[PDB]
C-alpha cells in the first residue's frame with residue numbers, strides 16, 4: 001500500500017515549486033528500513049476534491065513507471081494537507097549541477113548523462129508514454145554517475161524545446177520527444193545553458209524553418225553533435241528512434257571511455 005502516516009515524514013527545506021504548491025526535501029522513517037531522504041510535493045488547494053483528484057493523479061502517473069533513471073513514487077498522504085512522497089535526488093537540478101561543475105566534469109560524465117536519459121525515454125516509449133517536456137530543467141542528479149527524469153507533474157509553452165509540428169499543429173508523438181531530447185543533449189554539452197538565449201519565442205519557428213540549428217557546443221565531439229542534428233530533422237519520420245539514440249550514445253560513451261583506458 002502507498003498510504004503514508006504523516007508522523008513518519010519530517011518536512012525539510014523548500015527545493016522548488018510546482019503548479020499545486022511548494023516542493024520540499026524531507027526525511028521518511030519507514031517501519032522496517034530507517035532514515036530515507038525524500039522529496040515532498042505539497043498542494044495548497046486540495047481541501048477541494050477537484051484539485052485533490054488532479055494532484056493525486058500525478059502520483060498515480062509515476063506509480064505506473066519503474067526505471068533506474070526516472071524518479072520513483074514512495075507514497076501519498078491523502079488527507080489535508082495532501083502530500084506526495086517521492087524519491088529524493090540529493091544533488092538537485094541538472095542545470096545548476098552542470099554550471100557549478102563546468103570545469104570539473106569530464107566529457108564521459110556528460111555523455112553518460114545523455115545515455116542514461118535515452119534509456120529512460122526508450123523505456124517510456126515502450127510504455128506508449130509521450131512526455132512533451134524533455135529539457136535539462138526537468139532532469140535531476142541522484143549522484144555524480146546517475147541522473148533521472150524528474151516528476152512528470154513538476155516537469156510541466158516551452159517553444160525553444162519543441163518540435164516544429166508541436167508548435168505549428170500541437171502534434172505530440174515519440175518523434176517530437178526525440179527533437180526535445182536533442183535539445184536536452186545540447187543543453188548538457190553546453191553545461192546547462194538554455195537554447196536560443198536572447199531570441200523571442202515567436203522567432204524560433206522562423207529560424208528553424210530557415211534551416212538554422214543550435215550550434216556545435218564548445219569541445220563537443222562532432223559524432224555527438226551529429227547525433228543531435230539527426231534529432232532536429234524537420235520531418236518527424238526522418239528522426240532516429242529512442243532505441244537507435246540509445247545504441248549510438250552507448251557507442252560514443254564506450255569510444256570516450258576507451259580513450260582514457
Ligand SMILES: COc1cc(C(=O)N[C@H]2CC[N@H+](C)CC2)ccc1Nc1ncc(C(F)(F)F)c(Oc2cccc3c2C(=O)CC3)n1
Nearest residue numbers: 015016039071086087088089090092093138150151154155
Ligand atoms: C536536494 O534535492 C534537491 C534540491 C534542489 C535545489 O537545490 N533547489 C534549489 C532551492 C533553492 N532555490 C532558490 C533554487 C533551487 C532541487 C531538486 C532537488 N531534488 C529533487 N528530488 C526529487 C524531486 C521529485 F521529483 F521527486 F519530486 C525533485 O523535484 C523537483 C524539484 C525542483 C525542480 C524540479 C523537480 C522535478 O522533478 C522537475 C523540476 N527534486
